[PDB]
Amino acid sequence: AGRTGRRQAIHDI
Amino acid sequence: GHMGNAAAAKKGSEQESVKEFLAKAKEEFLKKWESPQNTAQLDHFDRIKTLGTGSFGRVMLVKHKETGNHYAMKILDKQKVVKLKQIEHTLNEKRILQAVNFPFLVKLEFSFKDNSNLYMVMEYVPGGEMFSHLRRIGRFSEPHARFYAAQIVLTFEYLHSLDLIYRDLKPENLLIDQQGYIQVTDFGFAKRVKGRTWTLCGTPEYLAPEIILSKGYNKAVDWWALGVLIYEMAAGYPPFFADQPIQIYEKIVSGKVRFPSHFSSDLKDLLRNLLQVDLTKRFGNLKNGVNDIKNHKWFATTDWIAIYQRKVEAPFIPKFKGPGDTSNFDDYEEEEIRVSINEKCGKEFTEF
Ligand SMILES: NC(=[NH2+])c1ccsc1
């Protein structure tokens, strides 16, 4: 189980 | 040895030509990096369709009213770009894009800003995102994945020679052009870095362990991300796969990876050496640099010069119905572009 759609990048985690 | 005399001599000469090329490429980059603005305005373009959306804005297909050429226009809402590292990163993106030149890097054509937004207008690549083709077909055969990977290897060799780290490799960021070759777009996380850098940024599935562990890190994070990309292209899913980011991070840091039974042994060996937590052992980060990757058995059939010169027949040519065709992109909700009467964040974006 994991993300199958488009993944957003994080600029500052 | 593995190579006979003729083969080893050719390879050596080839590597020296690479150094000659990169020296000239740096000279051209530095000229534009030192002397980079405002090459058009919004009303010069008709807006056609939204091609992608993210946190801070959208990418739209636009048509230049004067020439009729089509372009991809990225729109950033200056207010939404509120976070400290969101801001610096936007200036990085524009300045890098206006200075680079490589056959697999998208070409910036105009940039400008108004009271509300920042705009970057670049070449339209109508074949779509690798992401959607990959999800549609499931996975790419190893020769197909290899063709794309070779282009990323060459692109990173170019970028790293200019002291640029890319930091957001993933299929969502790779467009397929009319000849079936890659165009890397989205330089929002790219940065010029002479040694280490410290920002915690990227996409969770593709983060190197040293980013997750809050270490000062270097260009080797791009070679880790190459390993994630190759795995995802060949498997159909990434190696560190979970519902929430914190679970993804734990798998990344563990030093463990499992492979599909259909992966070739050559592919698994390459990926073990790219998805290496120990930086003293990660391919791309050793004494021989990128050549440890280029000379790996899994790339033995790759003609590196022929890829660069675009002489290799692509495994897949996207369908194209004519200029301005958007059939290879997904649909998104459309929101009109509202420009405020009053300038927002004028000081923050003075350099843009
Ligand atoms: N910049 C992108 N990721 C993009 C997506 C669809 S068209 C351009």
User: Within a 13 Å sphere around the CA of B326, how many CA atoms are in the beta-carbon half?
Assistant: 18
Among B331, B332, B330, residue whose Cα is nearest residue B131: B330
B175 CB-contact burial (10 Å; exposed 0-12 / middle 13-18 / buried 19+)? buried
Q: Please tell me the distance from the alpha carbon of residue B327 to that of residue B136, in angstroms, as a whole number.
A: 14
DSSP state letters, B226-261? HHHHHHHHHHSS-SS--SSHHHHHHHHHTT-----T
Tokens of B170: 């993933």
User: In this structure, what are the phi and psi dihedrals at residue B266, rounded to the nearest 5 degrees?
Assistant: -60, -45
Say which amino acid occupies B184: V
Yes or no: say if B164 and B138 are a contact pair by the CB < 8 Å rule: no
Say which amino acid occupies B97: L
CA distance B128 to chain A (A): 14
Are the Cβ atoms of A12 and B86 closer than 8 angstroms? yes
Among B81, B75, B79, residue whose Cα is nearest residue B118: B75
Q: Which residues of B touch A12 (CB under 8 A)?
A: 83-86, 199-201
Q: Which residue has the tokens 């801070």?
A: B56
Yes or no: say if B163 and B305 are a contact pair by the CB < 8 Å rule: no
Residue with CA closest to ligand 1 atom 3: B173
Q: Please tell me the distance from the alpha carbon of residue B179 to that of residue B323, in angstroms, as a whole number.
A: 15
Among B96, B80, B71, B284, residue whose Cα is nearest residue B186: B96
Strand partners, B202: A10
Q: Which residues of B touch A11 (CB under 8 A)?
A: 83, 85-86, 89, 188-189, 199, 201
Say which amino acid occupies B137: I
User: Within a 13 Å sphere around the CA of B317, how many CA atoms are in the beta-carbon half?
Assistant: 7
Residue with CA closest to ligand 1 atom 7: B51
Instruction: Answer whether B155 contacts ligand 1 (Cβ < 6 A).
Output: no
Say which amino acid occupies B306: A
**DSSP conformation class of B179:** T
Q: Please tell me the distance from the alpha carbon of residue B68 to that of residue B314, in angstroms, as a whole number.
A: 29
Q: Which residues of B touch A7 (CB under 8 A)?
A: 170, 172, 203-205
Q: Which residue of B129, B187, B331 sits with most ligand 1 atoms within 8 Å of its CB, as the best mutation to test the pocket?
A: B129
Instruction: Answer whether B59 contacts ligand 1 (Cβ < 6 A).
Output: yes
Catalytic residues of B: 168
CA distance B28 to chain A (A): 29
Suggest the residue from B53, B81, B93, B172 to mutate for an interface test with chain A (most A CBs closer than 10 A): B172
Domains (range + CATH), chain B: 18-35+129-319 (1.10.510.10), 36-128+320-350 (3.30.200.20)
Helix/strand/coil for A10: strand
Resolution to one decimal, Å = 1.8
Q: B327 in the Ramachandran plot: left (φ > 0), alpha (ψ -120 to 50) or beta?
A: alpha
Q: Please tell me the distance from the alpha carbon of residue B38 to that of residue B59, in angstroms, as a whole number.
A: 19
CA distance B15 to chain A (A): 35
Q: Please state the residue numbers annotated as binding site of B for ATP.
A: 51-59, 74, 123-129, 170-173
